[PDB]
Design a protein around this ligand. Sequence first.
Ligand code: HEM
Ligand code: HEM
Ligand code: HEM
Ligand code: HEM
Lengths: 140, 140, 146, 146
Amino acid sequence: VLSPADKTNVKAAWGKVGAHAGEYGAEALERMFLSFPTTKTYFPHFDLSHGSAQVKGHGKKVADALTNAVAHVDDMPNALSALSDLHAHKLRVDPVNFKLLSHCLLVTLAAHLPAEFTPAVHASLDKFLASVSTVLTSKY
Amino acid sequence: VLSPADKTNVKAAWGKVGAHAGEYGAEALERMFLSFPTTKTYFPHFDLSHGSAQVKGHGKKVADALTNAVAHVDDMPNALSALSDLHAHKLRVDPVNFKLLSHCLLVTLAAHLPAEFTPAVHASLDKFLASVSTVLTSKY
Amino acid sequence: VHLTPEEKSAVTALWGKVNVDEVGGEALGRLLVVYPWTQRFFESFGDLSTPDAVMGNPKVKAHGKKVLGAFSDGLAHLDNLKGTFATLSELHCDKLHVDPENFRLLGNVLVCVLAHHFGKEFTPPVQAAYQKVVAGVANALAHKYH
Amino acid sequence: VHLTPEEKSAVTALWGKVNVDEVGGEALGRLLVVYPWTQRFFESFGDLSTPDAVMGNPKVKAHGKKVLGAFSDGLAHLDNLKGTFATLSELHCDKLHVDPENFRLLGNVLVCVLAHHFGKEFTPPVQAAYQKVVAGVANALAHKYH
Ligand code: HEM
Ligand code: HEM
Ligand code: HEM
Ligand code: HEM
């Protein structure tokens, strides 16, 4: 579940992120790969070095998926249907890894939104990312 | 998600369990309390000894909730609404604990259904119990 | 890990009844079927399209033997699981890069296999003792992350 | 746990800038708000009805100090975390009965608090080094389950 409060908190947070969405996505990816090196095995063909155009490009895609989820918060399974299929079936992502990327996305937001990242907003974002992760892991 | 195959597997499994539902529930509880002693703290006022009428009684309630979920597999959040509220809000059950009880429920079924507990049926039951657990943890 | 004598007895007594040529491939097989992302680390093994495919698969049955071989080993060395699994940790951690939650899962699947095969014999205290074992093995395998 | 010199530097340099009277209660507070089941082990502390209640609560701020005290300690003893936390493990495991996943969560919340306070300074390599630390602390705290 996501309360109306959680939804306004999440919308608010994404509002302030603004056009930095893609860049924060790339940063969250880098945080994940450095902090949790096991996640690197899903991207053997990427250059994962700092400044990698491939991480940057992929960060924008991750952020765009998250924004699409925010924009359709009440029907995420439908919105995220192809992505769920991709990650469970083709990519076979270990469900544990969604928790790790979600934490790095939270770290990234915290690192950039000193005002917005209140305890309440932290809580709402955590639930939002857990709901996305639930969707993305629904199709094994 | 639960495919039509998963649903027929789960229905089949519950069919063979039959009137032993409550007894298996009590057994699953005992397996959990012995294997995962941390779970015992949620039942300070229970006698948890073997043969405990309180474990037996509570086992029947657990099994009846599971059967109600099976019986309304396509609308579990509605069916399990009060139970989700109870466990998240009043009881504050650590979400990790649902995984542990789910494993003991699987062990119990395996211990009693040599014919039914095929690899495919194992898989369907795991997904069924993960869906119930998802519902019961949706309301923090 | 600390097993009491009654715990050691419960484990050892059942473990001598185990078909070491079969239980291993049954546990590994079920793991690949129940937790399909684990099939990421086994594309080589061939037809994993179906449960029958995975279960009736040679490389699975072949490999589960060693896997089962590992658990037997540590059952003799609850005192020194870290020392026992030292090598194999760098294998799954430094070389394979596998999350330690997955070792807990294999352990739990092995427990389900033991219950399936022993039925009534796999009582709640016997399960409790086997949980300590697979917990200790999973942890020792993950020491190269710790 | 093995921190490289650059990892040790990244951690130590930031850790000296930390307000030890505040960060502790911020991390603990957020844990109780974000993961509300953790409030099961703290009914005594009073008004935990709201985030403002929890955050603006004396017993939380009081207790987070010690909690933060613990992490500082282990930051001096990455060589002997098990030896460092020995006592406190029997406390949370044998006496309190707490799942080790929860220690990982507190560690992650502390990392979010560090990022919030240090912003740009909390770079991805600095985070990576802090993750090794909180991972090692969480594991050492759970040794009384292992
Ligand atoms: C909030 C969680 C996640 C979101 C929103 C997300 C989003 C996306 C999106 C939008 C793509 C687009 C691919 C494309 O269309 O070009 C993608 C691909 C991919 N994702 Fe994720 N993802 C998430 C979690 C994860 C995790 C945890 C992993 C593994 C650690 C992962 C691994 C991959 C891989 C390997 C690809 C394909 C990379 C390639 O070869 O191009 N994802 N993801
Ligand atoms: C498949 C998962 C679960 C199911 C189907 C389930 C079902 C139920 C049901 C039907 C009740 C009924 C209470 C009543 O109406 O009298 C109950 C109560 C309760 N459950 Fe669960 N439950 C599950 C998981 C858990 C877990 C993991 C824990 C903690 C380890 C837990 C702890 C409790 C407690 C403490 C009560 C109240 C006990 C009392 O004081 O009477 N439950 N549950
Ligand atoms: C649970 C998730 C696990 C995964 C995903 C995994 C993955 C793998 C992979 C990919 C290999 C190499 C096989 C190949 O492709 O040639 C391997 C080897 C092996 N694994 Fe696992 N592993 C897991 C857990 C375990 C555990 C818990 C044990 C024993 C306690 C174990 C015992 C072994 C052994 C004994 C070998 C090979 C020995 C040899 O070749 O000399 N594995 N594993
Ligand atoms: C993460 C979940 C945790 C929970 C739910 C938990 C729970 C508790 C509880 C109930 C107490 C007793 C407080 C009281 O009611 O009087 C306590 C004490 C304490 N905890 Fe935690 N704990 C957790 C993790 C940690 C971690 C990771 C650390 C440090 C690394 C820590 C450090 C301490 C300290 C230093 C004390 C008391 C010291 C003293 O009183 O002498 N806790 N904890």
